[PDB]
Design a protein around this ligand. Structure first.
Ligand SMILES: Cn1c(=O)n([C@@H]2CCC(=O)NC2=O)c2ccc(C3CCN(C(=O)Nc4cccc(CS(=O)(=O)N5CC[C@H](Nc6cccc(-c7sc(C(=O)O)c(OCC(=O)O)c7Cl)c6)CC5(C)C)c4)CC3)cc21
Ligand SMILES: [Zn+2]
Lengths: 386, 831, 277
């Protein structure tokens, strides 16, 4: 089941129409705590977090006018995090900038194959409905607060030369390199003896230790993940792990509201340690899969955002085994998605509703073999799992 | 809102650095000691230290140095604070009045830049042509000295090497040349540069950048003889000078890490080395000659001079006597001797100076006469550290406050007091090195071992599997004990020992339920290096009677209990982001009543009747209310502004005081009665004040006397806080009129008073952090008000020009030095 | 002189391309949001959780709070005759259908399947065979049958739906194609031609009253083919010949009124050819 085959680069490429993307890589930065007017693209209901790549297909003439308007502009558009779908119930969102755009205008209608990426988070101040073609909202950007090392306060000035230590001996080849972490704690957090808390408590708030703890479990999820792929910065690492968390909207917006990277890492670790069973969205007495069957098949992680050829985004989750699921369709490749893996609609026995797809390699000699493609919306994790 | 008054009741006693020079006069040798924000100048007399001055400048001391720029005599001082407030000082004496004049000053902060994790480096060119500051990564600030740069205008030179361990200037060079070791993936390399002010950039180094030991940390510049520099690592000492490279690896220094150094003689033949654990060695240079221009070293030799306190700085002053500026313990004035003392130690101590040091915990306890409440603090760490008893006045010794030391030779962590047994429940922990196969051994005779009774906990719980495999030969494992210490003789009566690899987190003394007996409740957590987050802990209870302890109850908790308080009639504990209320049954057993989960690790826990303040390390503070008619906790208000945070306290039912990163104090007020529910569910921050000290513990009570003026006292309530540098400050609450009057006084005093380094007091006290820097609000700098009476009468007249205010705060009657003096001398009694 | 439509029909029969034709017409079909029609609190009122009426095509003529309807309206400018599409009438959706046809000024009702198709319940019966007047207090509706009106190949169940609270009445020629089993087509297209001629001559295909409502308890499999043959008859018989597939795609933009089997397409083409002249 753990045999490694086929390259994880392909799903991230979003091979839906080929190549010749905009690919400007120019990026854009906005002043924090400022108040910017920004167009909100409608009918894109989903929680987007920074760093995540979002594919989009547009059919509404208002939306294609929006696409053009962005394409001359800085092309950063808002994506609200609808707490309730009732009308909007929107208080926070995430700006997304375009990095990949092509236009074909198939038949007499117009189609847009824009791919964007989230950049910054914000708190919505005035939603409004100006430009009845496309809603523009005036929002306040949430600043990214970064904290210094918790031992910088005590500041044992003589010991300051000992704050720099040799790098990890080897990435994972040596088990004695775990003693390096046991030695890292003794050196960096020695000045904790001047405070009222033990050394290990401060290690529970260190960014590096939390990053390594997550990285260890991520490599437990994927033995082939290896190093050099995850970002070194704590801020980007926290966002990347948040992308691959099979959680509901309430937890997702809870993660988005968190400003400090250390807080994000701590809560990501707690969810990653607690939630170990996913049931159906409505019938909680299903228990489709547990934590021990998750595996990543793309660099973004076990979870990724894809769009069917209808404009509907699907936050799929790759998983080895899914129980109480019955196939509906037939193994037809049709759309690319995962290259040459086909798809069959799946449903839970108790609840007559869509859950995900089933991918079976068409070449019969691919290691991923048969896996499941469950979606976030159809799955509801349980905190106690009991 | 939330008008508060903060006054230092005890100056900081931990030294950051001390320098020997000729500051006061060319013919006098001076020692300058930097106790955080207090610079003190002493004069050596060959029989001791003669204090000559003390100055409380507005800021910390990031770096301090002495240099004679050859332009004049009497030497000069350079000071750089944590807020980048560099200044040049001269000791100008006028007959009898002693003054510290500022030749030049300037703020040397960069607009945009991440401060280097290594920290501030403050090197001075031996020719005094320049000074070099390492403040930020990849940059090297330079300040020339030519009598012109009176504004301390510095320019930054780009540096390719990012991670720099230590930098120094080179003796005997026609142009200013620096040397520094740095870390790259290849390893640690010692590079050098030739900084030139002509092109305002660097040049080629005199020699190459050979590799050094992977743990190279110290760089030392020997004087013009021998040239070159010395690199000190964990286990290797090397000397580099051009082609010459001579390295030795003595086994004596292998035990610990060298963390202190300085020259011994102007020729640089001898050097003093202090290590991490307090041992002191002396390094020798052979001064080998072959012809003119010897510039050679035959070999290097070190010798274990002896054992002193844990050194933070060392200065060889006068001869034989060396001032070891300890920071964890108490600074000494030990004297070197050419001959051993029949014990292998060439060092003999002759004077020690008090140092409350860390003050990890405090206990305001009223001893003998009621009202005169003394303070007991758990100072120091490792072999240093003691119970410190501070008593204000005498009702024999003649001192404003008397300090009594009770050495423990191990680090204490928490303390409680018991009236019934008249005892002190002090938590403590020692370090033991594992044997080849034994159960570890001690290193010193500690308090937890030299006791009348030495019972050990033998609980049957926690019989699960574990892998101590990691326990190699040299493995300093912490053994935790609870010590029952007599109130009167302060002799350790009992030394109960906890389970192996069990961390005693919290301790309290209370009288639970209807039971008359009082107990010491100790909450401990089972910790294992493999497990990042502890999962098992226990709440044990002890009763002390007839000179013995007895575990009368011990409750498994399946968590890591961090802090426990005595909720009226019950036990309020915090386990793991859960706050649990335990009831004391008549069967002598804790019984859980209700547990509330608040999604944040409840580190700090305080009570104010039925209100409970819960605080995470990262500023997450929330309020809870225990409704007795039901028996559950309802969340009242919360506040999440992610920032480092060290302690909390409840001033009253509405204001909550706490500490924050960069040595700051904050007061959050529950406004309540708001129009909107979500508005009244959020605590409004009100007070911000850059204290300049890392507050470690809060404690209600005062050290002066009981209520003297009853309700006529302007100050309402009074708390004390103990810090890491040793200051014990006092915080009180005031009225609106008094707050306005004292703030006007503060502004006018800042207008009239002259600081040291020409540093604005408003900038110094402004709440400083990485997010922003707001000016201080809601706090009154009690030190300034108390210093108001310390200036001349003409200054008092100049500071009261058109005040009005004054007596009774009525009819805006004009002010005079009769009630302002009165109000100041009344305020100076609260502490 | 035969037209190119008959030649294309014969070509499709010869090369056996009906199944590929339907497959490609379904692949080239395009969907529309229809997001409002599906809600977590609306699944109870949705007869089929699979299908969903497009938000732009569907009209929420409810004049109240919430009150979801699983209905839709189609309006093609080429035919100038709007039609209403619905689903199996659950009692809540039954009252919704009552108010829908009451507000739309409907003139006829077309039912194309039995209650007991495949010996099972697929649509909920709501019209009595005899008069059997019934008053529903959910919305103050009155149900009564004008006559039995049994025909050779079908039946007419004309109702006299009256609102008492509003105080008005409306007579609708509620047709009912009796000779039709579910997921199938009648063998004789002549009966279909006669029935559709009778319906078109009944005033339903006129702007006199509100658009007629056509339903087969699903509004997709059976109503779609009838609607497309009707629009083809009123589209290309009145002048220049128009290709069937393009206008079929155009009306498919309104709703997914597919056929689920190219046999229905063959029947539609046969009926259109028979109704040429
Ligand atoms: C969806 N998609 C994806 O997801 N991906 C990727 C795949 C990769 C992956 O891994 N992930 C993804 O995301 C796709 C990739 C490619 C593509 C191609 C694929 C092909 N394609 C279209 O299909 N376009 C399209 C356009 C408009 C509308 C529709 C909907 S539809 O075609 O029209 N339709 C189907 C048949 C249903 N039939 C039914 C259902 C329920 C009940 C009854 C009863 S029960 C009953 C009784 O007896 O009671 C009845 O009555 C009998 C009578 O009266 O006849 C009756 Cl009827 C009957 C009705 C229903 C639901 C409405 C479809 C073009 C693009 C599609 C992807
Ligand atoms: Zn289900």
């Amino acid at each position: 089941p753990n045999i490694i085959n086929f390259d994880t680069s392909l799903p991230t490429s979003h091979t839906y129409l080929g190549a010749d993307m905009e690919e400007f890589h120019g990026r854009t930065l906005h002043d924090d705590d400022s108040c910017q007017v920004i167009p909100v693209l409608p009918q894109v209901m989903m929680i987007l977090i920074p760093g995540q790549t979002l594919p989009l297909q547009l059919f509404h003439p208002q939306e294609v006018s929006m696409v053009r308007n962005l394409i001359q502009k800085d092309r950063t558009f808002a994506v609200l995090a609808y707490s309730n779908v009732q009308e909007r119930e929107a208080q926070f969102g995430t700006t997304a900038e375009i990095y990949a755009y092509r236009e074909e205008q198939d038949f007499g209608i117009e189609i847009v194959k824009v791919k964007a990426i989230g950049r910054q988070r914000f708190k919505v101040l005035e939603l409004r409905t100006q430009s009845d073609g496309i809603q523009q909202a005036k929002v306040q950007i949430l600043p990214e607060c970064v904290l210094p090392s918790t031992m910088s306060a005590v500041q044992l000035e003589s010991l300051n030369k000992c704050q720099i230590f040799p790098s990890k001996p080897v990435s994972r080849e040596d088990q004695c390199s775990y003693k390096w972490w046991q030695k890292y704690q003794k050196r960096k957090f020695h000045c904790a003896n001047l405070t009222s808390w033990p050394r290990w408590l401060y290690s529970l708030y260190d960014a590096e230790t939390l990053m390594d703890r997550i990285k260890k479990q991520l490599r437990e999820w994927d033995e082939n993940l290896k190093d050099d792929s995850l970002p070194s910065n704590p801020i980007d690492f926290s966002y990347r792990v948040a992308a691959c968390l099979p959680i509901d909207d309430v937890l997702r917006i809870q993660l988005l509201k968190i400003g400090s990277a250390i807080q994000r890492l701590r809560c990501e670790l707690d969810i990653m340690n607690k939630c170990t069973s996913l049931c159906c969205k409505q019938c909680q007495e299903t228990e489709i899969t547990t934590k021990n069957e998750i595996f990543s098949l793309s660099l973004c992680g076990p979870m990724a955002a894809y769009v069917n050829p209808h404009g509907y985004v699907h936050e799929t989750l790759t998983v080895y085994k899914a129980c109480n699921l019955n196939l509906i369709g037939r193994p037809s490749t049709e759309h690319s998605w995962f290259p040459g893996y086909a798809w069959t609609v799946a449903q839970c026995k108790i609840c007559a509703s869509h859950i995900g797809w089933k991918f079976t390699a068409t070449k019969k000699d691919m290691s991923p073999q048969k896996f499941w493609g469950l979606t976030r919306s159809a799955l509801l994790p349980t905190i106690p799992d009991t | 809102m939330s008008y508060n008054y903060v006054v230092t009741a005890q100056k900081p006693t931990a030294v950051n650095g001390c320098v020997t020079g000729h500051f006061t006069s060319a013919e006098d040798l001076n020692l300058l000691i930097a106790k955080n924000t207090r610079l003190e100048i002493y004069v050596v007399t060959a029989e001791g230290l003669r204090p000559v001055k003390e100055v409380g400048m507005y800021g910390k001391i990031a770096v301090m140095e002495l240099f004679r720029p050859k332009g004049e005599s009497k030497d000069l001082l350079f000071i750089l604070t944590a807020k980048y407030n560099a200044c040049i000082l001269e000791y100008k004496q006028s007959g009898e009045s002693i003054d510290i004049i500022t030749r030049a000053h300037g703020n040397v902060q960069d607009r945009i830049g991440r401060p280097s994790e290594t920290g501030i480096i403050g090197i001075i060119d031996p020719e005094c042509r320049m000074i070099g500051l390492r403040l930020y990564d990849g940059l090297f600030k330079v300040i020339p000295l030519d009598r012109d740069n009176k504004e301390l205008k510095a320019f930054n030179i780009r540096l390719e090497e990012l991670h720099v361990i230590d930098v120094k200037f080179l003796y005997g060079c026609q142009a200013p040349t620096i040397c520094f070791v740095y870390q790259d993936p290849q390893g640690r390399h010692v590079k050098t540069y030739e900084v030139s002010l002509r092109e305002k950039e660097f040049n080629k180094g005199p020699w190459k950048q050979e590799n050094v030991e992977a743990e190279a940390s110290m760089v030392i510049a020997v004087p013009e003889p021998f040239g070159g520099a010395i690199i000190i690592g964990q286990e290797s000492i090397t000397y580099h000078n051009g082609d010459k490279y001579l390295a030795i690896a003595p086994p004596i220094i292998k035990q610990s890490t060298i963390v202190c150094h300085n020259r011994v003689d102007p020729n640089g033949s001898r050097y003093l080395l202090g290590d991490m654990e307090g041992r002191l060695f002396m390094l020798l240079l052979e001064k080998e000659e072959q012809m003119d221009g010897t510039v050679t070293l035959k070999d290097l030799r070190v010798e274990l001079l002896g054992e002193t306190s844990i050194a933070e700085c060392l200065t060889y002053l006068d001869n034989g006597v060396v001032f070891v500026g300890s920071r964890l313990g108490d600074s000494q004035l030990v004297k070197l001797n050419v001959d051993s003392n029949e014990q292998g130690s060439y060092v003999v101590a002759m004077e020690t100076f008090t140092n409350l040091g860390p003050i990890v915990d405090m206990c305001v306890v009223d001893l003998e006469r009621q009202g005169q409440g003394q303070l007991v603090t758990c100072s120091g760490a490792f072999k240093e550290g003691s119970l410190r008893i501070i008593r204000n006045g005498i009702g024999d010794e003649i001192q404003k406050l008397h300090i009594r030391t009770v050495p423990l030779y191990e680090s204490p962590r928490k303390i409680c007091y018991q009236e019934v047994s008249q005892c002190f429940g002090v938590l403590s922990s020692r370090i033991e090195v594992q044997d080849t196969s034994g159960g570890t051994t001690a290193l010193r005779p500690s308090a937890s071992t030299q006791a009348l009774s030495s019972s050990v906990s033998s609980s049957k719980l926690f019989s699960s599997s574990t892998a101590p495999h990691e326990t190699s030969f040299g493995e300093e494992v912490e053994v935790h004990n609870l010590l029952i210490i007599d109130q009167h003789t302060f002799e350790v009566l009992h030394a109960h020992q906890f389970l192996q690899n069990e961390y005693a987190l919290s301790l309290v003394s209370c009288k639970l339920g209807k039971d008359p007996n009082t107990y010491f409740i100790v909450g401990t957590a089972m910790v294992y290096p493999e497990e990042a987050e502890p999962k098992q802990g226990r709440i044990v209870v002890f009763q002390y009677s007839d000179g013995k302890l007895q575990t009368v109850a011990e409750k498994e908790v399946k968590g890591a209990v961090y802090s426990m308080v005595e909720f009226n009639g019950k036990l309020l504990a915090s386990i793991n982001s859960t706050v649990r209320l335990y009831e004391w049954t008549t069967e002598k057993e804790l019984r859980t009543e209700c547990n509330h989960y608040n999604n944040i690790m409840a580190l700090y826990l305080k009570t104010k009747g039925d209100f409970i303040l819960v605080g995470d390390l990262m500023r997450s503070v929330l309020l809870l209310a225990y409704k007795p008619m039901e028996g559950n906790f309802e969340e009242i208000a919360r506040d999440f502004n992610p920032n480092w945070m060290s302690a909390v306290e409840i001033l009253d039912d509405d204001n909550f005081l706490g500490a924050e990163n960069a040595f700051n104090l904050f007061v959050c007020q529950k406004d309540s009665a708001a129009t909107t529910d979500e508005e009244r569910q959020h605590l409004q921050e009100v007070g911000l004040f850059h204290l300049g000290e890392f507050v470690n513990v809060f404690c209600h009570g005062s050290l002066v006397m009981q209520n003297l003026g009853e309700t006529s006292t302007p100050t309402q309530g009074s708390v004390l806080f103990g810090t890491v540098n040793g200051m014990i400050g006092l915080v009180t609450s005031l009225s609106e009129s008094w707050y306005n009057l004292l703030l006007d006084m503060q502004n006018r005093l800042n207008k009239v008073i002259k600081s040291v380094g020409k540093i604005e007091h408003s900038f110094w006290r402004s709440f400083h952090t990485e997010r922003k820097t707001e000016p201080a609000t809601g706090f009154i700098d009690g030190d300034l008000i108390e210093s108001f009476l310390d200036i001349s009468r003409p200054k008092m007249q100049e500071v009261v020009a058109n005040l009005q205010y004054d007596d009774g705060s009525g009819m805006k009657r004009e002010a005079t030095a009769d009630d302002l003096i009165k109000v100041v001398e009344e305020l100076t009694r609260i502490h | 002189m035969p037209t190119t439509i008959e030649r294309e029909f014969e070509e499709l029969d010869t090369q056996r391309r009906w199944q590929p034709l339907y497959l490609e017409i379904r692949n080239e079909s395009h969907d529309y949001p229809h997001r409002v029609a599906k809600f977590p609190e609306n699944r109870n009122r949705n007869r089929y959780r699979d299908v969903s009426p497009y938000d732009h095509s569907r009209v929420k003529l409810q004049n109240a709070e919430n009150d979801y309807i699983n209905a839709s309206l189609v309006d093609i400018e080429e035919a100038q005759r709007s039609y209403i599409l619905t689903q199996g009438p659950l009692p809540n959706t039954c009252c919704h259908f009552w108010l829908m046809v009451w507000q739309q000024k409907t003139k006829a009702v077309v039912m194309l399947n039995r209650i007991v198709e495949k010996e099972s319940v697929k649509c909920a019966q709501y019209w009595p065979t005899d008069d059997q007047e019934m008053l529903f207090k959910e919305t103050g509706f009155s149900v009564k049958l004008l006559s039995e009106d049994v025909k050779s190949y079908y039946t007419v169940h004309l109702l006299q739906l009256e609102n008492i609270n509003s105080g008005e009445t409306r007579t609708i020629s509620h047709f009912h194609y009796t000779t039709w089993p579910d997921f199938g087509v009648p063998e004789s297209p002549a009966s279909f031609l006669n029935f559709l001629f009778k319906v078109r001559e009944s005033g339903s295909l006129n702007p006199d009253h509100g658009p007629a409502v056509i339903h087969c308890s699903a509004g997709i499999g059976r109503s779609g083919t009838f609607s497309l043959v009707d629009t083809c008859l009123v589209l290309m018989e009145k002048g220049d010949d128009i290709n069937i597939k393009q206008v079929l795609l155009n009306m498919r933009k309104y709703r997914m009124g597919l056929i689920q089997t190219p046999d229905q397409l063959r029947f539609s083409y046969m009926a259109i050819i028979e109704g040429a002249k």
